Amino acid sequence: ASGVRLAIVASSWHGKICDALLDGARKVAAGCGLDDPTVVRVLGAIEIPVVAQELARNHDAVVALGVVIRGQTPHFDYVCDAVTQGLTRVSLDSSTPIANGVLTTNTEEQALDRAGLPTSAEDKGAQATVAALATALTLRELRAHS
Amino acid sequence: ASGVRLAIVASSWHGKICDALLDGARKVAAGCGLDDPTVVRVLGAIEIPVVAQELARNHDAVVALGVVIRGQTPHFDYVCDAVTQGLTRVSLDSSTPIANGVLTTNTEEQALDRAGLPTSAEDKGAQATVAALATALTLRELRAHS
Amino acid sequence: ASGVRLAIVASSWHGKICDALLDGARKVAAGCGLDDPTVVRVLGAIEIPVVAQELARNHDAVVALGVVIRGQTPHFDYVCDAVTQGLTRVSLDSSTPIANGVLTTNTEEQALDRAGLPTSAEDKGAQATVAALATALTLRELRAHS
Amino acid sequence: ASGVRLAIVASSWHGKICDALLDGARKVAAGCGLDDPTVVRVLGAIEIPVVAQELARNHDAVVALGVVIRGQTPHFDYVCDAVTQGLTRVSLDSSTPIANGVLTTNTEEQALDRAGLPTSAEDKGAQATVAALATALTLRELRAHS
Amino acid sequence: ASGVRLAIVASSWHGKICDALLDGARKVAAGCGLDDPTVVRVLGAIEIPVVAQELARNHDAVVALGVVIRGQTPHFDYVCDAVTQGLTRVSLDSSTPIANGVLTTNTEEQALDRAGLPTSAEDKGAQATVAALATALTLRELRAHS
Ligand SMILES: O=c1[nH]c(=O)c2c([nH]1)n(C[C@@H](O)[C@H](O)[C@H](O)CO)c(=O)n2CCCCC(F)(F)P(=O)(O)O
Ligand SMILES: O=c1[nH]c(=O)c2c([nH]1)n(C[C@@H](O)[C@H](O)[C@H](O)CO)c(=O)n2CCCCC(F)(F)P(=O)(O)O
Ligand SMILES: O=c1[nH]c(=O)c2c([nH]1)n(C[C@@H](O)[C@H](O)[C@H](O)CO)c(=O)n2CCCCC(F)(F)P(=O)(O)O
Ligand SMILES: O=c1[nH]c(=O)c2c([nH]1)n(C[C@@H](O)[C@H](O)[C@H](O)CO)c(=O)n2CCCCC(F)(F)P(=O)(O)O
Ligand SMILES: O=c1[nH]c(=O)c2c([nH]1)n(C[C@@H](O)[C@H](O)[C@H](O)CO)c(=O)n2CCCCC(F)(F)P(=O)(O)O
Ligand SMILES: [K+]
Ligand SMILES: [K+]
Numbered sequence: 001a002s003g004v005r006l007a008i009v010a011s012s013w014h015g016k017i018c019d020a021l022l023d024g025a026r027k028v029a030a031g032c033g034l035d036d037p038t039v040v041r042v043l044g045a046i047e048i049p050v051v052a053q054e055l056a057r058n059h060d061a062v063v064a065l066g067v068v069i070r071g072q073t074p075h076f077d078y079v080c081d082a083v084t085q086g087l088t089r090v091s092l093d094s095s096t097p098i099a100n101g102v103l104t105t106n107t108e109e110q111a112l113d114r115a116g117l118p119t120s121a122e123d124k125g126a127q128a129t130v131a132a133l134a135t136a137l138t139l140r141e142l143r144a145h146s
Numbered sequence: 147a148s149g150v151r152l153a154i155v156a157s158s159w160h161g162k163i164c165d166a167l168l169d170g171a172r173k174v175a176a177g178c179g180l181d182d183p184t185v186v187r188v189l190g191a192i193e194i195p196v197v198a199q200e201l202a203r204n205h206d207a208v209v210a211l212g213v214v215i216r217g218q219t220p221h222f223d224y225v226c227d228a229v230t231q232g233l234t235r236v237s238l239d240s241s242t243p244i245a246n247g248v249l250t251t252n253t254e255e256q257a258l259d260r261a262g263l264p265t266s267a268e269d270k271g272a273q274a275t276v277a278a279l280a281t282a283l284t285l286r287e288l289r290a291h292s
Numbered sequence: 293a294s295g296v297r298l299a300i301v302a303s304s305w306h307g308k309i310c311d312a313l314l315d316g317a318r319k320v321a322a323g324c325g326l327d328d329p330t331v332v333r334v335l336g337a338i339e340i341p342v343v344a345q346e347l348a349r350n351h352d353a354v355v356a357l358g359v360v361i362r363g364q365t366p367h368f369d370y371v372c373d374a375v376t377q378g379l380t381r382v383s384l385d386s387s388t389p390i391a392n393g394v395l396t397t398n399t400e401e402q403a404l405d406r407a408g409l410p411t412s413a414e415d416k417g418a419q420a421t422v423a424a425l426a427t428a429l430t431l432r433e434l435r436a437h438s
Numbered sequence: 439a440s441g442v443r444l445a446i447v448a449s450s451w452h453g454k455i456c457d458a459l460l461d462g463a464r465k466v467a468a469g470c471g472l473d474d475p476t477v478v479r480v481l482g483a484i485e486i487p488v489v490a491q492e493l494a495r496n497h498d499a500v501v502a503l504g505v506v507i508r509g510q511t512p513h514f515d516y517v518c519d520a521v522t523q524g525l526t527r528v529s530l531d532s533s534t535p536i537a538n539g540v541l542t543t544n545t546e547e548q549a550l551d552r553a554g555l556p557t558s559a560e561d562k563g564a565q566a567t568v569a570a571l572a573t574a575l576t577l578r579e580l581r582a583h584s
Numbered sequence: 585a586s587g588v589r590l591a592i593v594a595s596s597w598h599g600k601i602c603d604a605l606l607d608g609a610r611k612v613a614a615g616c617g618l619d620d621p622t623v624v625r626v627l628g629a630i631e632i633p634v635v636a637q638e639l640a641r642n643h644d645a646v647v648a649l650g651v652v653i654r655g656q657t658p659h660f661d662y663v664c665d666a667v668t669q670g671l672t673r674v675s676l677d678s679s680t681p682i683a684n685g686v687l688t689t690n691t692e693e694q695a696l697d698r699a700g701l702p703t704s705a706e707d708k709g710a711q712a713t714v715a716a717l718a719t720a721l722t723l724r725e726l727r728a729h730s
């Protein structure tokens with residue numbers, strides 16, 4: 001995937017988990033021959049789509065990373081709705097894969113188990129990056145060349 | 147339906163169930179006189195809409211196939227929301243039927259029962275392909291000729 | 293309403309209830325002076341929006357008819373979400389009333405009770421056609437004439 | 439506020455409660471010295487957005503009035519989804535305030551208590567009309583002038 | 585951030601809490617070198633998106649502030665849906681961060697605890713303003729300059 005132009009936008013709310021997701025995404029990229037993806041940090045998940053929109057103008061794939069954990073109020077629901085609506089719109093507006101590596105969990109324990117920290121069962125940041133690269137390559141093959 | 151240009155995009159997440167959906171889809175297409183539909187694989191359901199969008203540009207119908215099974219977190223809900231929002235937008239943007247053969251189940255048992263395996267109650271992949279082809283033929287008759 | 297150009301698109305999933313809805317729609321149309329509305333059948337509710345979009349280009353109102361009954365899986369929810377998002381978009385894109393006569397029930401008995409059979413409490417097919425025609429006539433009044 | 443061009447669109451479903459909302463709306467408009475608002479009736483809440491779209495072309499603000507009361511089926515949910523999606527889209531397409539005076543209650547008593555009868559705790563018809571007028575005035579001040 | 589043009593739109597439903605969110609927003613802005621953000625008041629949360637849309641034409645970031653507290657009817661859900669859908673669209677239409685500082689809580693107690701009063705656990709008005717400003721600065725760096 002060495003010719004793929006990859007961007008990663010990672011939210012910061014939930015610093016340690018977000019750092020873990022970003023590390024996983026960056027390692028997949030480097031594993032795939034990309035040592036220099038564009039990496040941008042934003043404060044919360046709601047800020048991701050507008051930045052992803054900008055990044056989609058100059059990249060073949062964008063990986064969105066973040067962590068949303070339910071609390072005591074309906075806020076969780078609306079944060080997640082905004083992200084889903086935003087990322088879906090951006091991908092289709094730009095005809096560019098925007099992989100969703102934004103964790104949406106009920107508990108912190110669940111988020112930790114999915115961030116690819118040392119004891120985690122999985123890494124959604126890494127998975128989201130494979131998805132982004134694989135889709136970019138597939139689109140490259142489907143589009144105009146001769 | 148021998149003149150209809152059909153594309154099938156299939157998510158890889160639950161590989162065995164996805165293989166089963168694709169088999170049903172392909173057999174329907176072949177029975178209707180189409181031995182060579184455009185078949186594209188993607189990694190996860192979220193990746194389907196952007197690829198479906200590309201395929202809608204030069205096909206009369208697109209069949210989306212995949213399997214989303216609910217787990218411990220709200221992830222299931224947001225994957226399904228993205229797929230719904232995306233496929234709906236793509237079909238209307240492109241004025242092209244995008245048939246939904248993306249299983250959205252609570253259990254693996256339920257998904258298996260709907261993948262048209264020897265013992266399955268039904269085959270969602272075959273059903274979605276019938277729907278895509280029937281709708282394309284209907285649109286052809288509705289539109290400009292002769 | 294003899295001057296209004298009416299289309300009716302009806303899904304075939306749950307055939308007898310759909311037939312019942314279509315009968316109610318046709319009777320209202322005839323009563324309002326329209327013996328020959330454009331009637332198109334599709335396989336499932338998900339196929340309605342793209343066909344409604346096509347019909348909206350050539351008609352003053354479209355009636356969407358269908359039956360979606362909840363089963364074992366979350367699939368009901370997303371089918372209904374798709375229908376709602378699609379018809380809403382189509383109505384506003386085309387500035388054309390698209391009446392929602394798509395039943396969304398928990399049981400078959402509920403669906404029967406709203407299909408306007410001899411024993412039914414109401415006829416949603418008839419209701420949706422009144423809604424479509426009334427709204428078309430209202431828009432005709434509000435828009436440019438002399 | 440005497441120079442704002444106001445339109446009101448009110449659905450007819452639950453006629454008495456719909457009339458109460460409308461009286462509250464008209465009272466506010468008269469109280470603010472408005473030239474007779476454009477008043478349009480539609481059959482059900484789903485018809486409101488397309489008519490509000492037409493009204494927004496010729497008015498500084500639109501008040502949407504209606505009553506949706508939950509029953510036995512999931513249909514309440516999808517009616518409200520459609521209204522929410524439609525009105526939000528119309529407001530933004532037209533850059534015009536569309537005030538949401540559409541009651542969404544679980545019971546008839548709840549709707550009555552919010553419709554501005556002598557014994558009502560609230561008057562949501564009046565409130566929506568205040569919001570419409572205020573927002574129109576705010577926009578006028580924000581936009582281009584001497 | 586002294587060169588960023590900031591706008592704040594604040595709903596007046598729940599006056600005291602709104603004032604508190606606004607104070608947090610203004611303090612963050614002042615701390616980052618902005619003493620004079622554009623501040624606009626609206627009556628309800630549903631009015632925010634149309635005003636944010638106007639503000640986005642003339643500003644680098646917009647902070648939406650407000651308070652939606654659940655009551656006895658589903659109406660809370662649809663207000664929050666409208667705000668979520670609206671703000672998300674406005675941000676992407678305008679390619680401008682629209683920060684969501686609209687509290688969505690089950691109780692008045694919860695809203696007070698998130699408004700940054702003296703004994704509050706957090707200040708979401710302050711948080712939303714940091715988000716808006718950080719995202720504007722990020723976008724400035726990503727976009728065209730020499
Ligand atoms: O990445 C995130 N992850 C998050 O978990 C998050 C974020 N972001 N934001 C806010 C953020 O998305 C925006 O920056 C903010 O709304 C301003 O735009 C949140 O308010 N949250 C908290 C959502 C859950 C609310 C809760 F804290 F659990 P509560 O106890 O208030 O219900
Ligand atoms: O076809 C799928 N089928 C799926 O079941 C799926 C997919 N895809 N993706 C993610 C995938 O769609 C994207 O590739 C990813 O978000 C990157 O964009 C998932 O996270 N899932 C799992 C959703 C359910 C998560 C769960 F495992 F059940 P959990 O226990 O974490 O709640
Ligand atoms: O009119 C309908 N009415 C329907 O009830 C329907 C339809 N259509 N479709 C599918 C259909 O909308 C599309 O043709 C298909 O997805 C291909 O695009 C469905 O899958 N359904 C079934 C939804 C209910 C799910 C269930 F069958 F009960 P389950 O037990 O699998 O949850
Ligand atoms: O203003 C309304 N208020 C309403 O309460 C309403 C409306 N409209 N419509 C239908 C109507 O919006 C459209 O005219 C129709 O779908 C055709 O487009 C409804 O079906 N309803 C009722 C929703 C269904 C609830 C119920 F009838 F009680 P049920 O027991 O069937 O769940
Ligand atoms: O900022 C707000 N905060 C709010 O809490 C609010 C607002 N606004 N609006 C209405 C408002 O958004 C609009 O101005 C109105 O719909 C007209 O467009 C409301 O109806 N509410 C009340 C929502 C909850 C309703 C309830 F009071 F809990 P109920 O008991 O009626 O269900
Ligand atoms: K791109
Ligand atoms: K929790």
Ligand SMILES: [K+]
Pocket residue numbers: 020021022023024025115116117123125
């Ligand atoms: K990691």
Ligand SMILES: [K+]
Pocket residue numbers: 141142143144145
């Ligand atoms: K090619």
Ligand SMILES: [K+]
Pocket residue numbers: 202203204205206207240241242
């Ligand atoms: K096509």
Ligand SMILES: [K+]
Pocket residue numbers: 215216217252253254
């Ligand atoms: K499960």
Ligand SMILES: [K+]
Pocket residue numbers: 166167168169170261262263269271
């Ligand atoms: K099969």
Ligand SMILES: [K+]
Pocket residue numbers: 348349350351352353386387388
């Ligand atoms: K038309």
Ligand SMILES: [K+]
Pocket residue numbers: 361362363398399400
């Ligand atoms: K059932």
Ligand SMILES: [K+]
Pocket residue numbers: 312313315316407408409415417
């Ligand atoms: K009937």
Ligand SMILES: [K+]
Pocket residue numbers: 433434435436437
């Ligand atoms: K006129």
Ligand SMILES: [K+]
Pocket residue numbers: 494495496497498499532533534
């Ligand atoms: K206007």
Ligand SMILES: [K+]
Pocket residue numbers: 507508509544545546
């Ligand atoms: K009830």
Ligand SMILES: [K+]
Pocket residue numbers: 640641642643644645678679680
């Ligand atoms: K701007």
Ligand SMILES: [K+]
Pocket residue numbers: 653654655690691692
């Ligand atoms: K409460």
Ligand SMILES: [K+]
Pocket residue numbers: 604605607608609699700701707709
């Ligand atoms: K404060």
Ligand SMILES: [K+]
Pocket residue numbers: 725726727728729
């Ligand atoms: K740059």
